[PDB]
């Protein structure tokens, strides 16, 4: 969960669903 | 630059009300992720901010007319405007969210009201 | 209604500096990634960087990292862009915008400011 950007957060959330 | 480059075709085009037009977008690398294509289409009216039309390559943003449709995957995308309306004349941009944020160079769509002259002599 | 209002644009000599403001309204700021995007006259759109106001996490594109800084004033619900050592290539309409995420997980720029013009004159 070491994101630090909107892209990282976006890819992380999208993958989880 | 290490950015995902987006190249649109054509650079500009003209058509009449009721015509069907297509604008293409080619990415330097795939914009896909987990079965989704992270590709948006924005419409920019002169002097105004860009307005979202399509997101995730084919999804229509709320309130956007059904005549606008998006297709494609990977590195090749198309924006199709079936039956042009007078308000549809603007500069169109494809935009990707797979890696940070980049935009295509833009495609200017103009209204054709009269015919092109025939330069015969 | 969600709104973004930019201010601070004008004509600047090369090597000059300028601070742009983005006043956000109709939403509390802190949750969202706020961005600066520019558009050179008659040209395309270029992402400068982003900021998350709540923790002030900032990511500026490599191209702008040495001269452009993004900051926030949470009390004023505003984002800022500090531009230094301006060059002719910085002449552009500067927009602030935000990214939102849908229920399906897609994120994109939804609301934009009206834009402010920065002109780098001789």
> Residue C108 and residue B59: Cα distance in Å, rounded?
12
Domain range enclosing C55: 3-120
- For residue A17, CA distances in Å to A7, B39, C30, C100, C101 come to 16, 18, 24, 17, 13
Identify the CATH number of the domain in which residue C94 sits. Answer: 2.60.40.10
Contacts of C61 (CB under 8 A, 6+ apart): B100, C47, C48, C49
| Count of other CB atoms within 10 angstroms of residue B3 | 17
Kindly state whether residue B119 falls inside one of the protein's structural domains.
no
B1 located within any domain:
no
* Count of domains forming chain B: 1
Say how many Å lie between the first and final Cα of chain B, rounded: 50
DSSP C27: S
Q: Is A11 helix (H, G, I), strand (E, B) or coil?
A: helix
Resolution of this model in Å is 1.6
**Length of chain C in residues, anyone?**
122
Length of chain A: 17
Residues whose CB falls within 8 Å of the CB of residue C27, separated by 6 or more in sequence, listed in order: C2
Domain span including residue B22: 6-111
What's the number of domains chain C is made of? 1
Tell me whether residues A10 and B97 touch, CB distance under 8 A: yes
Chain B residues closer than 8 Å to A10 by CB = 97
The CA distance from B41 to B1, in Å, is 22
Which two tokens mark C92?
């552009």
Q: Which of B93, B116, B101 is nearest to B7 (CA)?
A: B93
Structure tokens at C120: 């780098």
Residue labelled with tokens 């990214």: C99
Chain A neighbours (≥3 Cβ pairs under 8 A) are B, C
Per the entry, the structure determination technique was: X-ray
User: What are the φ and ψ backbone dihedral angles of A8, each rounded to 5 degrees?
Assistant: -55, -50
Q: Read off the CATH number of the domain in which B49 is found.
A: 2.60.40.10
Q: For A13, which residue in chain C has the nearest alpha carbon? A: C105
């Amino acid at each position: 969960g070491d994101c630090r950007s909107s892209t990282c957060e976006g890819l992380d959330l999208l993958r989880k669903i | 630059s290490g950015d995902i480059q987006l190249t649109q075709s054509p650079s500009s085009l003209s058509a009449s009300v009721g015509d069907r037009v297509t604008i293409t977008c080619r990415a330097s690398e795939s914009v896909d992720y987990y079965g989704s294509s992270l590709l948006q289409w924005y419409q920019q009216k002169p002097g105004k901010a860009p307005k979202l039309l399509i997101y995730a390559a084919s999804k229509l943003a709320s309130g956007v007319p059904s005549r606008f449709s998006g297709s494609g995957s990977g590195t090749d995308f198309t924006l199709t405007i079936s039956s042009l309306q007078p308000e549809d004349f603007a500069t169109y941009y494809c935009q990707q969210t797979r890696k940070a944020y980049t935009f295509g160079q833009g495609t200017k769509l103009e209204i054709k009201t009269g015919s092109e002259n025939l330069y015969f002599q | 209604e969600v709104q973004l209002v930019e201010s601070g644009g004008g004509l600047v000599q090369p090597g000059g500096s300028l601070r742009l403001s983005c006043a956000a309204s109709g939403f509390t700021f802190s949750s969202y990634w706020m961005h600066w995007v520019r558009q050179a006259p008659g040209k395309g759109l270029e992402w400068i960087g982003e900021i998350k106001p709540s923790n002030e996490l900032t990511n500026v594109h490599e191209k702008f990292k040495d001269r452009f800084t993004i900051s926030v004033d949470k009390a004023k619900n505003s984002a800022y862009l500090q531009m230094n050592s301006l060059r002719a290539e910085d002449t552009a309409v500067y927009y602030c915008t935000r990214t939102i995420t849908t229920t399906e997980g897609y994120w994109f720029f939804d609301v934009w400011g009206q834009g402010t013009l920065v002109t780098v004159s001789s």
